[PDB]
């Protein structure tokens, strides 16, 4: 640039507000509706209210059963593979846990394949937790990993529900929730906010030179366009004054934006739409030519 | 929806006409002063004109009040001003 | 992303098509609070009356506007700015057409730098309100290293 | 003020220009950069236009308010508001007038046809160049003939007069003034018809459609030459600097400064001398200047220094040469608007909307000021402009007090139909997203992933009130397209109610039906507390509905309460319970249709809020959560798969041995897998509806919500098959599914068909207003203006059965359309005088389809009203359910209902892609049920073989019972034998038809004698021997096996009587001459008597078909835009007898014998086109002969008017009816008339034959002359079918057709003709900036309001009038 | 835009952006890599007889059709034995059952 340039970077804490779009890793893209308090929202029998609620109807239409498999994998994660690193690893650290893990493990998982805390010692279990250290939250490949038979078996090894679904309670009523539901911990993801996400508020800004169409920029936000598609909309309805001022008093017409504002601030209605700027400019572009357009009365 | 829209619609020969009546009624409602329905039970909160038309009192015609000579809708305007005390600009 | 408690169930109209309902605890804690950075460049070009200047001397403003600004027009680092506060202290001359016979007399008496320039600084866009994290420093040698550098 | 009746466009005359303009501009003097005051006497002057400042004078003698009216003495100038300089105009008296490039470059030369000169040559020769053309005078006899340089004639006298020899645009004037129009009209009407020469009749017939244009009410051609150049408004072209050093000025300020400088010098070369080699050099520079304001690029574009961009000319601002046209209609940036993410609003009703609070602080600021001075928030209007203009919290209250009764308008960018912009009551909601009503989400084709909708704010109260009774969403519950509501409970809402009204069934043995019997109630009463009868079973016994829920709460009862609680809560907020009881899953949309009809509009409003709340409420009370185990796998799955994997192994082994060949081994492997998916899919549908009726994933697919019988199969059982991107199906099916482990192979295969779908809407989301544009710009001039017309002319007969989507469908076409006359068909029902029939009426016309062959119904295509359209011929469609109202744009609501469904259509290639179908037939028709046999269009006759053989193809063979209902559908070929005739009763399981699936016997239809014609041994016939017959007879050779010279010879058995004369086929005048194809079997002698039904020839082999069918979006644009189909079918130019000429494997022929000719009428038929024509009965003119589409142009010239308006509107629906979209015929015919509004009459009445004018003006001329009196004149005419891109290209209005890229040929037509443009349409009314005629614009709606008090009051003034 | 059967293990047939462009871009897969002269060569574990070797080799798109390559969805204990003699294997577009 020329004559120095001062670039100030502004940082605003973008909290989670109505309008933000979030989605997981299956394709279930959605946008936050209303931030409902922890009051109305349901909750388990052991507290821990539900954080995020989705729509089960997004499965029949949107073929993505995979997202549900992750749900059963998140809830039962306290008894599948993470159990080996959430109990057998914590028992070696705290001496007040080694007395609970060795007993509460066999009662849940009696599989010969799994590590028997009762048989193996402190040294044995240690090395049996290094073979799967990288895969802390279990491990599942792409097209060759989990299975309908393997999963179900791994759900009966740890706490707590059976088969998957579990009986909850309504946050509003509080009574027994008719028939269990599928719950757990799904890994979702928040999507960044583009410049377009920033609210575009405009009422009275600057206008162009050749045309009387409002133009935004730095301070004043750009006005929304009213394409022909939107024109045929109001054109369809019986409304006449609505679409009339739409391309007159609103935008182009210069003598319209002035009288209108001076009338609303008084308390009365705005004077009937006279001659739009579009009617003037266009008309003048004809007189200069060989042809001529002139308005005629009754 | 809106109160008695059906009954309102029935009140007029043409849908588009009912809109013209209410609009014109709203116009006079502000300018001259206020309306025919008030004391016993009228609207509540802050509100608008259709409530009147739903009622029997109003009369909307093609040319209900005019003038003998020349087309002057204006005679109506004069009488209204004389009668209605609240004044607009 | 993160790991939260999910419970698939048609709540009450909200989760119609592709909607998402989250507890009020999500806003009470900065678990989804991300950092956004916007760049507002301000360039001063040559005016018909002469090159523009970058100083804190900007009329037609309040005290809280020039308060966060230094003696060069550029706001310090770590200012709790908001919608209306000045970020860049840029000035721009007016013109003989925009000048009045009253401010023309004092122009050749109390000095040229009295009432020749007007107000034309960069402010904060309506709606957004954050803080300054990084300021840009530049000073051309041909324009002399003033109080800025 | 008064309502604008109509505007008129015409050429500006010199005297007319000096009427609005004052003074005269001589020098290009603008305004300085210092002072804004006028400089000299140029485009900016105080005297000419007006001052600039307040009341001060240019000089400075008097500025005080002392002298406001009286002007100065030294310099008298009347000072007024600077606003006067805007409206006031000025003119520039040009020396030598110039021409307009619009009336020159245009193909239809306005001066080339009128004046006998080269329509393009001479133009670009005398204007710009120096080629002199004599005007007139007493010099040179050549008044029309032009000359050059050496051909310049001069007076060879001692003292001759001055020669008026000019060139360019100034010369054209006299040439036009020397041509008498009247003299060119009288000789015109004679030359065309009289003279036999076709060289002269084709030259004057074209130069007349413009000649009479000036003779009529239109102005004279002597106004096309621009003599005076009007200036451009001062303030319209400011010179204020932008930012820094860059300037933003119009491209006109650099053009007008050029024209003037090239004018004041020309004046000096007029009064004095005017040499041909001096004046030319002057206008040569002036012409190039004025052309800059006209058009740049048609010859020489004007570029700027170091910039290849032609200056934006005045005309370039309309047509958009640089491409600004796509930005002009892109959308005018509204001052009051916004945009943000959308969301769902449950508690939010259809009457309100949930918009942000901070957004209201900006847009709604004007309504705040006028409310602040009432309270203590703000003091004055001025001081309030620096407080509520930004972040303020004191306004939160006052602002909400204004949003009490002032709804706004929501809108999505892709606006298809009318529901693109609805009105809702704003509600202050925290956040940034806008709450959109769930039911309304159906109107807007979008989801909630990131889509953003705008929002506007009604200013005036007039446009605010009409936005709550005609614009509000809850008001228009019915779609413009059909009578089916768009807004309707979709998923989460219907899921709650569905789960409620269900009955669970588990372990049950004894039949428990307590509802009715008396012993059952007691028996299963104590059994409930026992161990036998369970609780979750079928049992109903108690008192009322309210008391029933009381028991169901104590774990005593379960069901029989959900149906009771829902049958009292809903009808609580709204009476009429007789109708309120049908919810279901498919009746969820039928309810919003039946409630409005019986009840009203208001009742429906609150009726939608009730179902909404309880719709999502019980949706959580039940919890229809979907899981992995919810996808119950059929136990019959592993069995079908095993049997499938064991079948493919056997086939492979049979190929190694020698059993199979290469045909039965392909269709066997693909078949066992093409059905394996269907079996396992249905295995789960009938397993859950008997074991567990309360399955989440199942119920959410069974009811409404979102579920398909194809997407569930994939996840549940196995995903059938996946085809390649091309179309060829893969021979390697996929077994693994979504549930189990899906390998990398099968996942890759499904990707092929997954790329198409998402790649389709990719180009539609960019500009969905492309398809709609082609339709809206066409029928935008259709406005409702019904005045008890009742035209019974051009009646359109509705065929009892549609054309044929496939080969023999069965549907009806009549909905909400008024009948033409009194038709009596039903045994009880009876449509009297023209009355708007309902939806239940069409079922009646469809019932007795075996009696009626044509339904009399008034159509839109045939209406008396020219511009607008009556209400009768139209229908009920509008915005509600009642009859169509006056003042409606039935043209924009019809075009928008076609472009919207076009987004769901398949987009491959505009010129048709292709498909894959198989042709099969069976020679066995065994009736299933009982009844009689119905036959249509068939000529049965008994032959000598004792067989009831028919003589026609495409026979409707269906089983019509005693109630008249279609139960069966068969296709009877040609030469088939029917066991029983028409009307004869039949029994169940009885053969009623039997033919040979190998031979197509060529049977005659008349009796007499056989005569060998055009058959000589060694030329066309040769002694051959069959393979099945064994009898040696004469066999006709092939077309390729024939000798040289026998290429024109065509063998045939011409049938003659006893007198030797020709025998005509009954019904028409078609000689009986059946041609004998090659390799035919002729087992008949010569001169031997025969009878009707006797076989002549035989066709050993049969073939044809394979590739055909179009369908999809591409075809849509192919119909509206009449073009050349992918598989053109050669229609029949003449209607008569039909008989194949050849049958050779190479080429097949088809010959028709009208009257005199026969052989010349040969039609080549390849092996691709499937023969749909027979060899007997007479086929209609324009009938389909091949298996493919037809040409709207050719078919129009053949059949008649009752075809095009019944075919182009039918073939289009055959695409939407497939996807599920139902569109009424009303919103399809209104656009068809426009493609036919132009035609060419054959019998001249007022104008000549070749004109190509409109048909509306030609319909009235023949109406008053015939119907009324004054010698009925037969003003017959011929239809003319065009495209939507051409029919709209040349319309009556000039602003309507200006929406294309040809704004040069249009504007000139409506100008030279002096046509009065009565703004009827709405699209042509928005651009001008007038008031929409639909409103309320309609003249019809003039009306004032009264109060009783006000009513007595005028009486008081009337009373005063009486004199004493 | 439509992925071809030959594009196996060299590019993900479902990694194209969602919006204005669908199938016009599509990123590059994992193990796939631009070798020397354009020809994309995806790694393949050379397995001799019934013993799988841990060595990797980059085969050309035209060389792959010359040899039969097994799949990854096959059961393997370690790297010296094979589960079943007959296991689903793929060639260059077709599917057949080959032995170890
Ligand atoms: Zn003066
Ligand atoms: Zn009609």
Residue numbers in the entry:
A (entry chain C): 1045 to 1342
B (entry chain E): 2 to 90
C (entry chain C): 797 to 945
D (entry chain D): 14 to 704, 717 to 1389
E (entry chain C): 548 to 647
Sentences from the paper on this structure:
RNA in all cellular organisms is synthesized by a complex molecular machine, the DNA-dependent RNA polymerase (RNAP).
Final refinement of image orientation parameters by projection matching yielded a structure of Eco RNAP with a 0.5 Fourier-shell cutoff resolution of ∼11.2 Å. Although the cryo-EM grids were prepared with samples of Eco RNAP holoenzyme (core RNAP plus the promoter-specificity σ70 subunit), the σ70 subunit apparently dissociated during grid preparation as density corresponding to σ70 was completely absent. The spEM reconstruction showed Eco core RNAP in a conformation similar to that observed in Thermus X-ray structures but with clear density corresponding to βi4, βi11, and β'i6. The crystal structures of Eco β2-βi4 and βflap-βi9 were spliced into the resulting homology model by superimposition of the overlapping β2 and βflap domains, respectively. An ab initio predicted structure of the short βi11 (see below) was placed into the corresponding density to fill in the gap in the Eco β sequence between 1121 and 1181. The Eco core RNAP model was completed by adding back the C-terminal segment of β' as well as ω (in accordance with the Thermus RNAP structures).
